[PDB]
Design a binder for this molecule. Structure first.
Ligand SMILES: [Cl-]
Ligand SMILES: [Cl-]
Ligand SMILES: [Cl-]
Ligand SMILES: [Cl-]
Ligand SMILES: [Cl-]
Ligand SMILES: [Cl-]
Lengths: 174, 174, 174, 174, 174, 174
């Protein structure tokens, strides 16, 4: 048996491995979204940058989970990573709606794992999620909702103008 | 005969002289495009700057070819430079479409010369084009395609507004 | 059709997408190797660091390929990422042998794509691989071979001592 | 009609366009002279540099004229640029004599345009030429005459020695 | 067999060893040329320095080839180094003509090896030569041709004067 | 006859040329030893560095002898350089034993030349060897003997472990 493992259930260990897969899937989704907005026939640099930075953040979250798995004496187990849900992501609005759906899914997985840790009286797990992930997720979802509202306000009768303006004046670009 | 010339065919020497003429023609075209956008009745400073900088880059490319011609022991031969294809260049969209056409023509001339150098087993020529020109061209054409997409998105029902916004918010200006 | 695409075959476009998948698979493999060596019952920090840094490099290589795909006017297409070949990676020697096998596979894929680009007279593709990947791969494989030789020399009759010493005295650690 | 044009005759507008062509022709001539002196079988670096710098100055003069054309509300009109008068330029002495002939031609065109502006009571045009071009031209022709005298003094009975010495000891080189 | 070797033919391996011998022979030739011009009865410091620096560069080129041999998993094999072709090298003109002959021989060996690598579909070898050697060689041969032209111009009827002047005013010295 | 030569015998002149050949042979030997230890199947970086630095030092010694030859008014005469005695150099111990043998041979040649200079009452030659070479040689041989002793101490029953440790903990490496 493990020389360090203490108060770390098999159920939590397994759910951590699943959450790693979810974060890596999210990272891959955001890589796809980022390169879609870099297409010459899409060409929204700020949208590309927004999603490339999220891909990086989600990968980091998976790495933090993996580090924690080892700190607790669990065993990292990797599974196939499913390809993102779409090959082409539509408008900035379509993309930002898909991103909010994805984030709510991740957030629910975090909440589910927190509730499992609570039930198993695993306060280190619960603290870990609170300190690394729960507020980051709430902040990110709020940011996406803010963006969605601004995107929606800009559609008007001139969708192309609005999509350009949002990319130029809200999102970070060179 | 030449004291330095080695593995440098008459066919390549001639094609290099032709490519010099093509780059100088492109430079002249961009000088014309730049000063058109500086007209008081056109007045798109960022568009002017974009094309003036390209004129400079294309002249530099011709100069690099001429330097290489001499390094190989070929003889620079200059021909008449034909005037650009238009005196007035229309909208920013018209201009950017003309520029992409021009660049694809230049790119094809580069590819043709590379294929000639390959056939003639002239690796110095092939390397020269790879290192100085092929990626620069691919990057420039990608940039132009990006610009075209943004310009097209902005036409909407309000072409003047969109042309102003693109010049103000995408292109570099004072 | 694409507004920028020029001299870029469907065969190359597809092979680039496949190569992206191979680099991302390699990255995932190295993530797994890195976290295996971070296990409390393995505990070889320098080995962990070696493979975590390779995971990062391979992801960057995939990103460069994706950037190039878009520069050429091809379309990025992502596929499922298969999980690494093992869940537990044995000794440092076992791991370094698996890594050399993986790298030779990647190198062969690079060479195959280069030969396709040559056959298709696609010098931008060929240059791209030469400049970004071929020498990096040769250097990495040489480094791994160097490491394998030192690891093998150290097995002697005292395998644990040798594995410790290699991690402490060859690999970078805190 | 033009919203800004005032006191700017069609005759002046046309003569400015012609003068632009003359300056660009002169620039092209100097590009040819510069690369001739860079030939491995000519190899006079200081002579090459002298003429390359003049090519740049003449292009700048054309650009200043074009800027002025637009400031006045005239319309830039480009014509074919004729190739330089020679493919091979002889000795430094031959070249410097050709350059003085070229500059006197340019100077006469400046004087002719100034006289037209005077006759048309166009003081902005006259000032423009005075401030940008007339003294620059007189200074350049004086410099060329100085150089010609030194070159001629050096021919003696040892032309090669003298041509080397002039390039080494009068002209700027690395 | 070799643990790292991949796509590296025995023909290329052998030709690399031969090219190493050629570069080391060239280095030795230039060492001899350098010390000849340091003789008290020759005494042309700038000529000495020119050839001593080339000796160093050629040795470095051999070392780069040897490094590459090992990176590819080939085996360095050294042969006897033949002494230079002359014990006394005549005038600066004689020496510079011998150097251009030597460099054209080296250049042809580079081109031959590049063609072998092309035929063997060895793009790493081809890139290596392109990036390290082909342009360096073209630049060096151009420099030598430039020097030869200036030396020849200076012979006139006063060979000693011209040889002094070239050494003092073209070549780098203390 | 020579304008500067004074008290410099033909016997010394010839022996200096021979000593130059010996130093260049030693340099070549050390180049071979250095690249052997850089093989992926040998992979002892510190051993490689040790011998590459000696190759450089021995070449410098030959150059100092050549400089002195010219200072005295003798004539440098180069001979064929024989290839090193082995293609593969065995273990670090084998290599260090071969190096000590080589250095003792060089040292004896120095002593022989010193004795010739003494017999010929050539104090400049004797001083030259004393100041540039004799103590450098004694110091180098002492260093090699120190290394041999440490290498021998480390063979024990675990030769690979000892060879690794010596390279890591005695020799300079990155
Ligand atoms: Cl799926
Ligand atoms: Cl025309
Ligand atoms: Cl699988
Ligand atoms: Cl004409
Ligand atoms: Cl011989
Ligand atoms: Cl031998």
């Amino acid at each position: 048996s493990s020389q360090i493992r203490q108060n770390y259930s098999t159920e939590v260990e397994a759910a951590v491995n699943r959450l790693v897969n979810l974060y890596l899937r999210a990272s891959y989704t955001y890589l796809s979204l980022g390169f879609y907005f870099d297409r010459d026939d899409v060409a929204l640099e700020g949208v590309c940058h927004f999603f490339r930075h999220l891909a990086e953040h989600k990968r980091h979250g998976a790495e933090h989970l993996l580090k924690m798995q080892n700190q607790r004496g669990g065993r990292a187990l990797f599974q196939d990573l499913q390809k993102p849900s779409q090959d082409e992501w539509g408008t900035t609005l379509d993309a930002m709606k898909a991103a909010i759906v994805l984030e709510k899914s991740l957030n629910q997985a975090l909440l589910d794992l927190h509730a499992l840790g609570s039930a198993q009286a695993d306060p280190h797990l619960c603290d870990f999620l609170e300190s690394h992930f729960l507020d980051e997720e709430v902040k990110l979802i709020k940011k996406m909702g803010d963006h969605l509202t601004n995107i929606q306000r800009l559609v008007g009768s001139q969708a192309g103008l609005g999509e350009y303006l949002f990319e130029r004046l809200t999102l970070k670009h060179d």
